[PDB]
Amino acid sequence: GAMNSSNYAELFNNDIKLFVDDTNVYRVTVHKTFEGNVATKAINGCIFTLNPKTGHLFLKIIHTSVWAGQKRLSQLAKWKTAEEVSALVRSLPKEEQPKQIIVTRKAMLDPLEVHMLDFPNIAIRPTELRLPFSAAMSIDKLSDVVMKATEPQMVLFNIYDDWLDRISSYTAFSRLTLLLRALKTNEESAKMILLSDPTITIKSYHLWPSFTDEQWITIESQMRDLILTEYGRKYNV
Amino acid sequence: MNTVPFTSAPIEVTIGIDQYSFNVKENQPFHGIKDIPIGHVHVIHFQHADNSSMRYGYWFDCRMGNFYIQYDPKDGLYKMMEERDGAKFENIVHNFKERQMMVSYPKIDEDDTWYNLTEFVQMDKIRKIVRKDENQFSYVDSSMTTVQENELSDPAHSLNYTVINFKSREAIRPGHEMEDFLDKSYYLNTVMLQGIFKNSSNYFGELQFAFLNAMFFGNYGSSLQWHAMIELICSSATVPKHMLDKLDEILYYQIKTLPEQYSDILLNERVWNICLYSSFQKNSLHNTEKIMENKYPELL
């Protein structure tokens, strides 16, 4: 059934699996109308579909045109997500299709189950983990490709850069979630930590800076400190 | 008026005939039930005083032959049987009537309860859900499983209810996933009514038979079928006006007849709250909503 801290290492075994996060599919700015009412303006979104073992990210850009003339958009957004994931599985060769898909939000279970009726052998699972994938749009290069899209588009990334050359997928996933947790809690502080030393650059083909192994320990330390502080402030403890 | 004679009553047992029930004592001189209204199906059902487990019974229609009950001390139950000798049977029944050893089907004249619960139920449709083609009557009990329960173990002793599954290729047209899941009208009208049942009467027939098996035998699989068939209609935006009016009457008499003390195990909270308050048909079941609110306001 549900994925939790008791069955954590299952993410890094050799059964192909994908996480699906729909938290950035339907994105709005709320604003006042001339008559003093409130209205929303949609902006481009994305489905965040990630293989936690390999770091392969299937970033499906959701262009604002998909919402034109539709009702109940927060509900449609779950079904559009399920439709695009299902289209992605069908597009993969059989030996690349996932054996499980884990949804970060339980409201995706029925939409995805119904879109995947043709794949009875693919397990659709919820998680009790509070994963920070909502912060994907705090990664500058992902935010850039979403906001510039003029039509629906799939962009492929490796969210771990070249880390798996040096560390395991357990450790790579731990670094990713720490980075995204920090970006979610205090974007400004997190972003300062990552680019404070302009001698460390981001390769054209990468998302994150080119940190040595010792620099990553210092960075990881600074992200934990940031997360703890913000927690003390939040809860006055 | 028809008669179901009993050879004897060798073990203490509560006997039901449709919505009525009588306690019979071990070896009490009891020889059956007379004045059974012609024109309806009937169920005669049993709960032994010594095992309040295994409620069991027999669906029959007196137009289809001469039926009697005889206790089998090997299999330890009251069995329905057919007497093919018309004269032997008339003679058996006349003797027992003359000796007044028979209870009278105690129908009140104003009382349309049994008609209302069995309006669409046909004996030929029961025999296709309960397969034992050598008998004209159908045995059901507490523990019999449905064909849909077996898929998720003896096929010959199963309830062959129509399988309904809201997350099935049968229920969901490719490319109409969200539409078909949130509005089941295509599943109700094309797949189930036009395709499988052929008409609303056969659909209501199975729904009423499922309820009655749930009520009389506490058959859990039957209760699941009854709720599924209600949910399929309430979750369809497009239902013929006459089906909704008839559904409100069907459910009203089912809720009216349920034992007050059984609402906890025979009524599914989610389904009823959905049907009455959330679904497309929330405004369409006035009689059913009024009886449910006055008689089971807790469940909601």
Side-chain angles (χ1 to χ4, degrees), chain A residues 75 79 110 113 115 117-118, chain B residues 167 169 177-178 181-182:
Chain A
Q75 174 194 260
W79 292 89
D110 280 348
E113 171 168 3
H115 269 285
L117 286 172
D118 293 334
Chain B
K167 294 193 289 195
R169 178 51 62 219
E177 285 82 6
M178 179 184 187
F181 186 71
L182 281 179

Side-chain angles (χ1 to χ4, degrees), chain A residues 15-85:
Chain A
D15 285 1
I16 301 166
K17 47 188 72 67
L18 297 173
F19 279 113
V20 169
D21 181 81
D22 67 317
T23 69
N24 287 308
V25 165
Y26 175 48
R27 296 211 284 163
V28 289
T29 54
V30 176
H31 63 84
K32 290 286 198 81
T33 76
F34 184 82
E35 296 87 18
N37 303 135
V38 172
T40 60
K41 181 173 192 321
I43 59 168
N44 293 344
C46 61
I47 307 163
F48 176 103
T49 300
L50 172 67
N51 186 326
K53 178 84 170 161
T54 62
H56 286 210
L57 173 65
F58 299 89
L59 195 76
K60 178 64 189 218
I61 304 182
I62 305 302
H63 185 260
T64 58
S65 59
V66 304
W67 309 130
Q70 310 293 332
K71 276 96 175 64
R72 288 187 66 73
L73 299 189
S74 70
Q75 174 194 260
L76 178 60
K78 302 175 204 311
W79 292 89
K80 177 50 168 189
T81 301
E83 185 174 42
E84 288 300 351
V85 170

